[PDB]
Amino acid sequence: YEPCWLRYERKDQYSRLRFEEIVAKRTSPIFQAAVEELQKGLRSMMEIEPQVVQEVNETANSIWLGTLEDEEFERPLEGTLVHPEGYVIRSDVDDGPFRIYIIGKTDAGVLYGVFHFLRLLQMGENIAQLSIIEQPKNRLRMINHWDNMDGSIERGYAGRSIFFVDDQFVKQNQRIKDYARLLASVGINAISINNVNVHKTETKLITDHFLPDVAEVADIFRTYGIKTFLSINYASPIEIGGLPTADPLDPEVRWWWKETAKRIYQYIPDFGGFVVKAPGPFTYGRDHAEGANMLAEALAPFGGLVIWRCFVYNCQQDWRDRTTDRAKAAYDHFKPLDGQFRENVILQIKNGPMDFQVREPVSPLFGAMPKTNQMMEVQITQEYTGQQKHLCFLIPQWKEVLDFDTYAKGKGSEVKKVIDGSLFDYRYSGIAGVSNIGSDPNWTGHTLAQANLYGFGRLAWNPDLSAEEIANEWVVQTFGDDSQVVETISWMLLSSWRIYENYTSPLGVGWMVNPGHHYGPNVDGYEYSHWGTYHYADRDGIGVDRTVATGTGYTAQYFPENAAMYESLDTCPDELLLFFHHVPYTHRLHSGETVIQHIYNTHFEGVEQAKQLRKRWEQLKGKIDEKRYHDVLERLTIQVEHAKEWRDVINTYFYRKSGIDDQYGRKIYR
Amino acid sequence: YEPCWLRYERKDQYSRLRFEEIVAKRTSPIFQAAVEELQKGLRSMMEIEPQVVQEVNETANSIWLGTLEDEEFERPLEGTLVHPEGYVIRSDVDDGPFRIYIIGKTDAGVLYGVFHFLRLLQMGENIAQLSIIEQPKNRLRMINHWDNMDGSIERGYAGRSIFFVDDQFVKQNQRIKDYARLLASVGINAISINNVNVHKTETKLITDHFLPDVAEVADIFRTYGIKTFLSINYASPIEIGGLPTADPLDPEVRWWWKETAKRIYQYIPDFGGFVVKAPGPFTYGRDHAEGANMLAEALAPFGGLVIWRCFVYNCQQDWRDRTTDRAKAAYDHFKPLDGQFRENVILQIKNGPMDFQVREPVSPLFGAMPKTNQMMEVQITQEYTGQQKHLCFLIPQWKEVLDFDTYAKGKGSEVKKVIDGSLFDYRYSGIAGVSNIGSDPNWTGHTLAQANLYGFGRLAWNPDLSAEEIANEWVVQTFGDDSQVVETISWMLLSSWRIYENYTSPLGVGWMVNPGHHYGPNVDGYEYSHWGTYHYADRDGIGVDRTVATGTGYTAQYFPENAAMYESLDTCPDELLLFFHHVPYTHRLHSGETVIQHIYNTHFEGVEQAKQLRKRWEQLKGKIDEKRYHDVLERLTIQVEHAKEWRDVINTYFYRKSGIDDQYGRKIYR
């Protein structure tokens, strides 16, 4: 498999460093991982093999690794560190030997500092006078795996599970170690290794039969500062506990979970906790607080956390009833429960109120629960964004969500401030991303999708990083510093999401995908289903009326500033118009386009743009190794051909329904 | 499991017969099966146990079983028998002991005669003066199973396979024997036990590893006059033969199949042959004649037959191209090959040119290949006709197909005359039906679906039987002779197909089903797919233009009389209008309804009719055992609720597209 962004490509003779020793003040597993990474990077890039020592040699050029407590003289900069995972990197200002100090608040801080130092070297930065201080914004920077133990991965487009096979754990762990290195390099500090939809075999991950293996995996992740979590089956008491119910208020059920927690911590002392998708609490007339709190109480004595997913809605909605709105479900179910959740419970909410569509407005829940920890869930695997066949760099979208001002406490109440816990002083909060990896040699199916995993980690560490700099870092580390290569791949990445949205669902209405696998155009795919995902297109217009005045009243879930913006047909942003209003095809957008012509325009032009992505990539031939050049070219060609299908299906569907021809007379099949 | 129509319900004291002996002139396995059936029927119904003897006792009331060669005095009636499976049943005209003679041309004839005699008793017919002669019209009266060896049944809605489980054959064969009795009772004389889509394990049914088991099953069917067939994987030479190709012209491939045939016949001397769905012949640039003839040559020395399915079409068609027509594919691919097929090859063609839709015009291939054996394939399992949740007695539809005059040789060239071989003097021909059975206790999922299997056999024996008499026979044997019960269930059966069509796809255009499982409404489900199943509905009209004048030219595949009827917008029957013409919603049908109002009418009224089916059944409570009463009631309620979904989805889709309201102001959801 590929090293992804940790290539540590050999430098030319004019870009090397002179170091004789690495001073490791600690011998903990995390320090060993940090030292090993430093040795690997310096050897591959610099062709040097500094000796690892435990005390500084005042006359040797060295890289010093330690925590504040290991310092001889604690300087002001590192003295300002408050976050456990924070660190400082600074070059000694003396005129003698060259010394680089990597000072972490804790061991994990040293590890992240080493990765940062190595990132600087891969990017060819001048490290003669460094003065860096970094502290992560989000406490939880997590990855959710949807891997099944039979090897399949739900919504996995990059191969099979690297964790399981034949209802067992894989015997080889070398790839898990390399995966841990990739995650740690971008600051990811938490991971749930199994599908949130817990099946028969997976339910047993919390039993003695599989805990030894879970512990072996946790041991590897622990060395890289990563806490391990398990997704659980709420009905476990029944399925494997032999109890007659799973009711969270049943005494025996409560005790069963306490005993289960105790058992897990005997194998994994620093177990992170449970990720829960939920026989469930409502099966017994209990609410989410009662259901989550029961699990929270079981984990409390051990410091474990309960990550309760808010992806709850009536999966049996009637398309006939336009008064019911799936988009309102999450808020209506959890908002009223604010303040009733135990302190170690974190509500995990998707970026949008529906289901990871190419574009969805921000979930109203963010900013609405001052007394309840919250963390956002984003999807790295491209379920509705191309399935790694189409290129789609998700970082720009995630920044739009993170930078969305909820106005919960007036201007300056961005989503990022909600989930980083600063706005409401949340004890536990952060962000989680659904893994896009698999057994494929390139890990992500589409070589360029590696940028989404890298980018997720970067944003999790600091949401303020620009999409531009994240793309630049990833391209340089993965493909080198040739200015043409960097500018071209960066442009491809930065423009990809808009290009894909252009030829898929219009103006934020979402969906229009084939049911089941969710890949490809099918305008009415779920239009008459019971999933609550409708566009209501007819011969005169299209869109969901989510207004308070005449619609579902969904706009009222936002604070006044945003509620008013979406409520008004005139101020509602074009990009989300059809998610909030039902309008005639002739309605004029802010862009000046009628709604119907906008549909035609973006679909015809989106294909043209996809062809440009391919053309620009082809111009890089000779500057990229043949293997990756062809791997990506193959996918770009697949993208162009499928984009044509998206364009024609959508254009024809709307021509057949609206009867309005393309303004420019471009080809729409009858 | 249920005895279905072979209930042999105990008669009252005033409806019995007096018999002391059963004279069995032969001891062959088929004769033993016939005698055993007679003993079972007479004991259960009459409460008598006649002694089985081999010579007539001139003073005893007896039932005589034998072939012409066993007769002491061959009377004129039986003397006219020419078909091997034919028989005569006649009461002796003497004034002494009562004697019933069941005379068959061959042993199988005696078996079918015994079932006929027993059918007369179940129906309470007066047998004092019988004079019956029966000869089947179709040489092949076959059942195709789509069972997989893992237990699943493709498009199976009546439970799992009764033949396989865990990639093995079931150990218990008692149910197979009872199944054979059911099939033989209605004259079915051939069966293919495995799915036409042959997977990995199933490919091995033609190898020594599974042949012993196949032989055990064949032994059971043989006792009931049923020949056994296997569906084969055309690529077997590669998958299990170790050869580098499956090319029918490759010498080694040809020899491999010859050796395979030889091996099979060593286990099953009377093996029927292969059913083939086809790496295939076209994979090597060979045509269907070359591909089928190679297999035919392998089976020829043993008397085996090759049943070559004509379900061939470009499963990668472009919806954009309205010049290509999937409906024309079968005819265009096989018509030109007429006269190039070996004599033991039979082309199996579906009743329609598409894929078992509720209504399709007759496949043009019937009547178009004078020099090629043909047999029709019908689908008993209700894939697109309700999946045994909705009631749908298929006999009326099959009669419409069988009675369709192709005019191949002028008036009187009905499809039934094509497949019974009389029109073109086919050596081997007939009809095959895709099994609707499964492990469910009632065999068919829907108790009343038992009528479809029964009815298939009756029509296979004699296509001239009316739907009314077939329904009457089935109801009486299955539910008794209460006049209310008979009239009610017969009415339900006879009206079911039209009722289901009423709320599904309109005017013969077909489809409008959910993709994948094919159950339920989804007007645009496959509308933009590559399967060639389109209705082309837009804001102005709907339908496929299959005319020669302006369309695909599909009408030209029929002989002049029918081609002209469909070609003209004015003469084309309403029931198939949208299959042949693209028309405006305002187009006036022969019924006087505009096309759009017809859609609304049949969908609103179809639901009303479904409610009536349920109401009529409820009125029979107390006259049917509680178990079956509730089993059927449960399904009828499921039908009514789903019918409402079909009605509303289709009505709303067309209101949204046409903008034309229901003439009567009935409820159409916006």
TrEMBL record, chains A, B:
Record's superkingdom? Bacteria
Keywords from UniProt, A to Z, are:
Carbohydrate metabolism, Glycosidase, Hydrolase, Polysaccharide degradation, Xylan degradation
Residues that bind alpha-D-glucuronate, according to the entry? E154, R155, N197, R309, K350, D355, E383
Q: What is its EC number?
A: 3.2.1.131
Q: Which residues form the Alpha glucuronidase N-terminal domain?
A: 4-117
Gene Ontology CC terms: extracellular region
Report which reactions are catalysed by this protein: Hydrolysis of (1->2)-alpha-D-(4-O-methyl)glucuronosyl links in the main chain of hardwood xylans
Q: Which GO terms describe its biological process?
A: glucuronoxylan catabolic process
| Domain Glycosyl hydrolase family 67 C-terminal, residue spans | 444-666
Residues annotated as catalytic:
D355, E383
Under InterPro entries, the record lists:
A-glucoronidase_C_sf (IPR037054), GH (IPR017853), Glyco_hydro_67_aGlcAse (IPR011395), Glyco_hydro_67_aGlcAse_N (IPR005154), Glyco_hydro_67_C (IPR011099), Glyco_hydro_67_cat (IPR011100), Hex-like_dom2 (IPR029018)
Question: What is the main EC category here?
Answer: hydrolase
Task: Kindly give the PANTHER family that the UniProt entry links to this protein.
Answer: ALPHA-GLUCURONIDASE A (PTHR39207)
To which protein family does this belong? Belongs to the glycosyl hydrolase 67 family.
What name does the UniProt record give this protein? Xylan alpha-1,2-glucuronidase
Q: Taxonomically, what lineage is the organism?
A: Bacteria, Bacillati, Bacillota, Bacilli, Bacillales
